[PDB]
Amino acid sequence: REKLNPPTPSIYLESKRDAFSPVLLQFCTDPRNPITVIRGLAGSLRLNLGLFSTKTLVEASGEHTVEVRTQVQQPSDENWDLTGTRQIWPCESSRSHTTIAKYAQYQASSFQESLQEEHHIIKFGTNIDLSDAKRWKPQLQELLKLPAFMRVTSTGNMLSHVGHTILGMNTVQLYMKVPGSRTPGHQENNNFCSVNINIGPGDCEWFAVHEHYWETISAFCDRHGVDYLTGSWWPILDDLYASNIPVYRFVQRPGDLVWINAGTVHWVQATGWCNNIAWNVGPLTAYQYQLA
């Protein structure tokens, strides 16, 4: 009943010196930590998160077309069937295109409309590519400030090589959200670790399960007729608990970085208005086992 709601591994850094440390690396890459939330790091490093505000993205690339997902707004622990009588696994999104500027108008308007003193659909801008140094140099330069183990460029500190860009397409991704925006359940591609920073002002609610349980999750997807690997799905928490699977549940506030270990099954819902930025940091999970 309480081994199933485990505490989420969490670090608060009072000093930047502790970010540039193999001790922090080892804490994060410990495979017993499906994720780790690092607080105070954006602050300590004085990262200009304003460079990732929607206003800034519109100024730089408002005319660019991006993918948008349309979803029924539901509480994070719910996913109803057509008849509104039962919970289900499949997580339906329609996929469409709009411009960054158009998404930004919707994001800002919906926020403005929420300010009154105390079904529905929402739209989520996904897979916004910030990889091109020709368009996004200031943003990428800010990301170069992170410790080498969390850095997009690893131990490198350059964005060009002999006059050519070096990052491939879709290396750095941004997600523009409103409350209800869901990232359905998945493991990170290629068994790489990744990092995710919330720009705010709103929060993201996260759910995670240790890799060890992935096959049981896949079996649930099978029973509900959705592909584990390629399909869109949202776990029914009661099913997980009834199978004795611990679920990590936490909130990622503005400035918090989430380290995601390889194989961790996770899913996320915005509870506020926010953007998130994310990139992979290579196959670092359990690397310390090399030293033993």
H helices of 15-165, in order, are 22-29, 41-45, 54-61, 100-112, 133-143
Q: x/- string (CB under 6 A) for ligand 8XQ, residues 140-179?
A: -----------------------------------x----
Residues in the chain: 292
Answer for which of 29, 76, 232, 276 binds ligand 8XQ (CB under 6 A) is: 276
Task: For ligand 8XQ, give the closer residue by CB, 175 or 273.
Answer: 175
Give me the amino acid identity at 67: E
Return the residue matching tokens 């607080």.
Answer: 39
Distances (CA, A) of 202 to 36, 269, 290: 20, 11, 39
- Taking the complex as a whole, the smallest distance from the CB of residue 175 to ligand 8XQ amounts, in Å, to 4
For 264, residues 6+ apart whose C-beta sits below 8 A from its C-beta are: 34, 35, 187, 188, 208, 209, 210, 211
Identify residues 236-275 at the interface with ligand 8XQ (CB under 6 A): 260, 268
Task: For ligand 8XQ, give the closer residue by CB, 102 or 182.
Answer: 182
Peptide bond into 201 cis (omega under 30): yes
Answer for which of 30, 105, 278, 287 binds ligand 8XQ (CB under 6 A) is: 278
User: Structure tokens of 75?
Assistant: 């509480």
Answer for which of 36, 76, 79, 183 binds ligand 8XQ (CB under 6 A) is: 183
Count Cα neighbours of 42 within 13 Å in the Cβ-side half-sphere.
22
H helices of 65-179, in order, are 100-112, 133-143
- Taking the complex as a whole, the smallest distance from the CB of residue 160 to ligand 8XQ amounts, in Å, to 27
- Taking the complex as a whole, the smallest distance from the CB of residue 270 to ligand 8XQ amounts, in Å, to 8
Give me the amino acid identity at 104: A
Residue 188 is labelled as binding a ligand: yes
Task: For ligand 8XQ, give the closer residue by CB, 83 or 230.
Answer: 230
Residue 224 is labelled as binding a ligand: no
DSSP single-letter state for residue 9: P
Task: For ligand 8XQ, give the closer residue by CB, 16 or 31.
Answer: 31
The residues binding ligand 8XQ (CB under 6 A) are 175, 183, 188, 194, 196, 260, 268, 276, 278
Q: Which segments are annotated as binding site?
A: 186, 188, 266
